[PDB]
Design a protein around this nucleic acid. Sequence first.
RNA 1: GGAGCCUCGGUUGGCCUCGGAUAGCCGGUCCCCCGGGGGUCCGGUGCGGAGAGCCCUUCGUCCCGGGAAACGGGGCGGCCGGAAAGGGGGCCGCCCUCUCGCCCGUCACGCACCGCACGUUCGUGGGGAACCUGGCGCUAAACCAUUCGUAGACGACC
Lengths: 176, 247, 138, 109, 190, 199
Amino acid sequence: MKASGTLREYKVVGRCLPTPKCRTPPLYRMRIFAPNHVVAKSRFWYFVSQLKKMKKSSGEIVYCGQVFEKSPLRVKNFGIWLRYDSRSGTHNMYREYRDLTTAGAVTQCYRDMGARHRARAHSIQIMKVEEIAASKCRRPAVKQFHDSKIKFPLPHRVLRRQHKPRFTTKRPNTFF
Amino acid sequence: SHRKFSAPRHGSLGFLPRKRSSRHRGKVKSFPKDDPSKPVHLTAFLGYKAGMTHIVREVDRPGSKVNKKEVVEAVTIVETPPMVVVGIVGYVETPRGLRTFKTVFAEHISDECKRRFYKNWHKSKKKAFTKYCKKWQDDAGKRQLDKDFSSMKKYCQVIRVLAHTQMRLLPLRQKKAHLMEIQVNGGTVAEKLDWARERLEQQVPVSQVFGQDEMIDVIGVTKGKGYKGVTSRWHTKKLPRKTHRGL
Amino acid sequence: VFRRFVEVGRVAYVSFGPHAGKLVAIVDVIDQNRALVDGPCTRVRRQAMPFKCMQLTDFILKFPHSARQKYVRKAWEKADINTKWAATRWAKKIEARERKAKMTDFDRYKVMKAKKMRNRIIKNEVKKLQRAALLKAS
Amino acid sequence: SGRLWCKAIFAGYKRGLRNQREHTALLKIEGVYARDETEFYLGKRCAYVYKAKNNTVTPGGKPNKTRVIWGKVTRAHGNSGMVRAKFRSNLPAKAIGHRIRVMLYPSRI
Amino acid sequence: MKTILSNQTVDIPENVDISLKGRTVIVKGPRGTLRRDFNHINVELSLLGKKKKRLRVDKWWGNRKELATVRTICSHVQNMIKGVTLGFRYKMRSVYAHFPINVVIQENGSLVEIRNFLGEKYIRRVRMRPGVACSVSQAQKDELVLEGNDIELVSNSAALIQQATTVKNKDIRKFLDGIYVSEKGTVQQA
Amino acid sequence: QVLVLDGRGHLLGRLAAIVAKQVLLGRKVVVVRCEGINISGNFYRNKLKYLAFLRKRMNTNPSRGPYHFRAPSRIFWRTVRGMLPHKTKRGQAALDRLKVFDGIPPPYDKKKRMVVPAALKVVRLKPTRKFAYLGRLAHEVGWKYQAVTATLEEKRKEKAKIHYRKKKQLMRLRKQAEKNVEKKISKFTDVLKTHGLLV
RNA sequence: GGAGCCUCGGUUGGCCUCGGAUAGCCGGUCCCCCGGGGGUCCGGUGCGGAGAGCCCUUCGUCCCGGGAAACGGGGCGGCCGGAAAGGGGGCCGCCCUCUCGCCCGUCACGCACCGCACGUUCGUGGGGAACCUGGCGCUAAACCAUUCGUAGACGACC
């Protein structure tokens, strides 16, 4: 699990091999977040082998599909439940974000945990991504965007293209 | 390992490159910092170390054991014949230091000062400053020197004056004078220049530059003693008698 | 102090990206550094563009903070941004930056000779204004 | 009665960090500062013009003292403006930082 | 996180007449005029309201430590309003045990002389800060009142003489001798 | 063909990196106003960072040891010297194309100065950090001409304001002139608009 | 101030300048106050009184017309301003000079060297030798040897 690129979401279902002892095994659905579907089906076995006694040698993937966003043009407040590991013991977390797709939020969560806690991607176990309303929010860094009349300027502007006219004559204005 | 008992180092590292000086005549490294409050004056002079003797005087430091008594103090005699102003030089304030702007000299220079501009006076034709001596007899030259003066009133900050001694008055063997820049400290630059221009070709006695019961600094060249070992230069302990390769 | 506020319904220009050189209206602000944006009558699909790749203008058009393309278009055409925009000093010196970029070589020669004579009438005229400026001062 | 070439500085050879391959020259042409701007210059014939002591016969002229080394622009180098060139003789190292011309005449316009 | 906005208005009475050139503010009124620079704090200073009754500072996208700079302007600008309509009056009591602190002021309240501190021969000649006018009060023996407008000067000058009269290499609990600040107040009431 | 660079508001390292490349490419550069250069970090940190440089002298003979130049121009010239292969010929041939000065000398005050915004303090710093003026740092290490240059640079300032005031007037007429010859440059202003030059 | 001969080479239109702010600037008007500054008001600000820029633009000519010019185009004498590492910068008279210079249009011509490379510049470049031609000029010093002894191993130094 290398959290490369924008993550996607996959609904992968599997089951044990059919045996004369048990006619048809039950089906197990998951929600995996992976860059490509190949490392999705691998990350699938990692979870099911610790919630069940099943391994890839005694299972079969039944459906490796990608699920798209129901409303990619709506802004949403996503609630993520984590299981990351530090250098000393593992912890449960509840991190909140604000994005357009759940995969857009999960990616954002992976960059943030790496940024705020120096945890690499192989240490984190996303367990629940729930769409919650603006009243059930808890983290203050996202509640501040709940305003029908939000209004804010752009402060002192970090001038880009600072190398295209590399040797100018005028002092570059930063107040737009 | 460490040094057993400490001991202060011999000699000073301040006066470090103990070499034969590159100047026979003492050279003023720093002049007093001027201020327009005081009237114009000189700050330096030039003299010749004659000899030494005693002095009996009445000590007047209240509190001492020697107060209101007689002491004998050793005093040096500095024969100082009056010096002759023969020129002025300007200086501009640069961020790279202090550059010399413009030099003006006198219409007539004594042969004592003209001795200095030659290495062999016997062979030379004594042609120095001749064509400069013929720059005060022409309307195209008198207005030239007026330009050189009226320029120093604008751009010069430090004005030093060029004076030389009078070797004829001395009893010495040599007759070649000693030149010296003497920083005129006083009022503003203009009156520092009018005062200096008027003093041209004139004698300047010590009473113009020093008073009595005053405290001054002496600059000069140490009495040379030649090539000396470590014991004479730095006074380090002579080794014990038993040493093989010298002590 | 600030005059242009990033708020719901401010028209913005676009600096880089595949949508550069177009106008686009801010629907709602998503993140600290990313906003949902939509220019319906400008060949710009509704999407999210970060604040780096946009330069907010001084046009405002009012509508609720999460309406769909149907309502923004009626608010874009009501205030009629396009015609007013192309009449601003900003867009006029934008369409003048491209009129110099596509200037052909023969057009470059027609503008050389045109410039040469307009720098001889102005220069000689200001020379007449100098021989009359010390005249009115002496 | 005018210049007919673009100004280009000969930066260095195609080097690694501890090896340089002198059969290829890195060229820095003025004004071009991106790979997408080098498309115009690919294939253009370049020239390092110098002058020496002895006289050399000149194509269509009198024996002067100037000599050239002809080359060509092979492919775009780096990610900003630079470009590789290949000359009929590997360029002398005393041309580093000196002006070499790139002409226009193999043009694709 | 970065808070989208944090502001703090400052209501001013009518006696004051504030004008501000950019991020520096000048204040004037009866007692004189004041002027402080704030080009080191990176805020928006907006002077709103017709007949200019209130001044507000802003801070967009500021973290914790920048938001701690929002009110310290509002506090700094209020002390300009006090130092223009009411002024500052720092009272100082010279408390001693055996040696009476002989303190005399020179040049109409601009230099402070301190003789016979702990029975010493030294004069702790203290130069005041320009804008401060010191004096010994009448109807009180061991007093030293400081006046002025800028609180950054009347207080700092007080700290000079309060740290000029310090006992060295003794027990500072036994040797309580020295001048100390006793009352921070205004010149006039309202 | 001479890059004249103004050091007012430039960061020391970010500017020296850009200068050193141009100098390596046969470009004669002059970095004027070295005392306006400012290093990042608070002042007491930078002073310590330079005082530790003054302490590295050859123990057996300091006269051969590292020459700690105190003038701001030579400090900036020193850091550029770091980014060049100054042991080789092409390195030493480079450094001769670089000429640094404190203040603005006469051969350059009447020329236009450039600005390198990729090395500009207003650009490359968050507006909460602290920075150390190279002039103040060099003075507190031994540059004994800070007072002189502060008046020589001030002198050429007011001598430039005279020129600027005589330049706005020298073009306020030019704006007023076209309003007085409008009918006879009309045929030359329209062609100067249809090809995007006077719009 | 004239032409040629060696040698070193690199370049191949110029930009003549406010200060400086960057959570702010820039230009005008001056209705305004004190001897230049402040305040004011009107405008500009993804800077167009923009370096994303400006300026100059070069095939040469010859007759004729149109627009623009007359104060212009080119010249010998003086004068001021200039010092941080100082323009061959500008002002006045001058005998001459031109409606030529630039832009629209005509007339015709200039090896049209037969598809092909170092072309086009800064260039009276730097340096060194010899020769031209005139004028205005200018007729020294250093070292040795000698002497000194304020100095000194010898040099050096006085």
